[PDB]
Amino acid sequence: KRSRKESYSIYVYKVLKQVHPDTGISSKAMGIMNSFVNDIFERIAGEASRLAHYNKRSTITSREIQTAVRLLLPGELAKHAVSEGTKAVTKYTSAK
DNA sequence: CGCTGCGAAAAAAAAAACGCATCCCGGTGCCGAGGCCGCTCAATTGGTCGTAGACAGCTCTAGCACCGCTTAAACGCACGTACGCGCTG
Structure with a gap:
């Protein structure tokens, strides 16, 4: 058929439908x-x-x-990204 | 005479008429999103190995206080000049 180019578009869709289900x-x-x-x-x-x-x-x-995220992202954006990141890590560790 | 009133006359300014561009309404029609079909290769499992990094300390650097002598900057004020600022043609 054709070679296989990966993307992120399916993971963007899912997040779009979580955030604006009518869009x-x-x-x-x-x-x-x-x-x-x-x-x-x-x-x-x-x-x-x-x-x-x-x-x-x-x-x-x-x-x-x-620390990467704290250096790259600005104040507010960083805080949250740090928070959404820590949250995800804790919930992964505790699942095993 | 002065006052004044008016009658322009002069702009102001307004209003209003014109005409033009930007919006929006509602039915076309087209194409690309969005959603299925299989299917394939990349993520998961589980489990082996071996070493990166956590810790428990051992060292000796180098960074933080204190301390007056000696200046060279800072503060500061007064006087005056060159520049920044605005209006017009």
Whole structure:
């Protein structure tokens, strides 16, 4: 048929339907959301990595992703992202 | 005479007429979203190994107080000049 290009578009849909259940999203914009995710992936991973290296750690922990997010994101956005991030970690650990 | 009243006359200014552009209404029609079909490869399980990082301390650096001598800046005020600021043609 054709090779398989991955995305984030299905995970954007799910989050869109959670947030505005009566709303669609044009291809062109779904692109722009994809780009966005990808951009803010590379940025948090990047700074995460730099943090690890700078401190001689070979392991990127949640602790790095957290500090990455505190450096990249502005005050309010950071707080929440730190909160939604910590929440997710706790609820994953406790599930096993 | 002065006052005044009026009658312009002069703008103001208003109003209103015109005509133009921006909105919105309601029925077309087209295409891409959104939703199914299979299906395939990437995530999960579970479980083995070995080493990154947590800790418990051991060292000696280097960063924080205190302390007067000695200046070179700071504060500051007064006087005056060059510049910033605004109006017009």
